[PDB]
């Protein structure tokens, strides 16, 4: 990972002066990130999930876990115990490697993107972002894909403040506004 060492050098010295952190352990470290793919159309089509599952595995570097139906909502025609959701978590070494896959060539691939809606935080330093497409990622072949499957990314860090969490996003050249 090229930006993992990039994190280990210039991000911490940047954080020590911006919030006067008197400890290197007091810095927010970027933890796991999840690529959510809650298809929702899995009410009768078993084949539809297998695509967005293998595709989500193609986007990442591992097979995602199928999220079963937790509650019983008659409005979405689901009960307890129905395979509908799909998620994969990037944590550790491959967490950094996938971050490179996005912030370098994939993030500017979003149409008319020169700044991001920065106020989409959680309140406890973790950033969330959903994309309507899949094409933006280099792994998509464009011509073999039969439907636009948008995935959702969660940036779980150990940051407690949103701007301190956004400060971590600032050290990674994030187009904000």
């Amino acid at each position: 990972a090229k930006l993992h060492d990039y994190y280990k050098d210039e991000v911490v010295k940047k954080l020590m002066t911006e919030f006067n952190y008197n400890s290197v352990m007091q810095v927010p470290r970027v933890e796991k990130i999840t690529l959510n793919m809650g298809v929702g159309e899995a009410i009768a089509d078993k084949k539809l999930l297998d695509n967005a599952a293998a595709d989500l595995a193609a986007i990442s570097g591992q097979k995602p876990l199928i999220t079963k139906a937790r509650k019983s909502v008659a409005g979405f025609k689901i009960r307890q115990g129905y395979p509908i959701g799909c998620k994969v978590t990037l944590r550790g070494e491959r967490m950094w490697e996938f971050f490179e896959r996005l912030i370098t060539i994939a993030v500017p691939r979003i149409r008319d993107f020169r700044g991001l809606s920065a106020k989409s935080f959680d309140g406890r330093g973790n950033y969330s972002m959903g994309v309507r497409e899949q094409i933006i990622f280099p792994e998509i072949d464009y011509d073999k894909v039969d439907r636009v499957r948008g995935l959702d990314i969660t940036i779980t860090t150990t940051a407690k403040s949103d701007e301190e969490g956004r400060a971590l996003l600032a050290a990674f050249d994030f187009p904000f506004r």
């Binding site: 090229k2 595995a57 193609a58 570097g61 591992q62 097979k63 491959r94 490697e97 490179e100 896959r101 912030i103 370098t104 060539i105 993030v107 500017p108 691939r109 020169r114 280099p138 792994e139 050249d173 187009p175």
Partner: protein, 41 residues
Amino acid sequence: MKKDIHPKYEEITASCSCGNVMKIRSTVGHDLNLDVCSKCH
């Protein structure tokens, strides 16, 4: 890393017309060039 469920990686150099060609552990097929990237947008 649990075996058999992982797709394979490759050392893909994210090529750019400006010169932002950097290797990324990816899984597409080859190394492609494009303008709009991290430092060519």
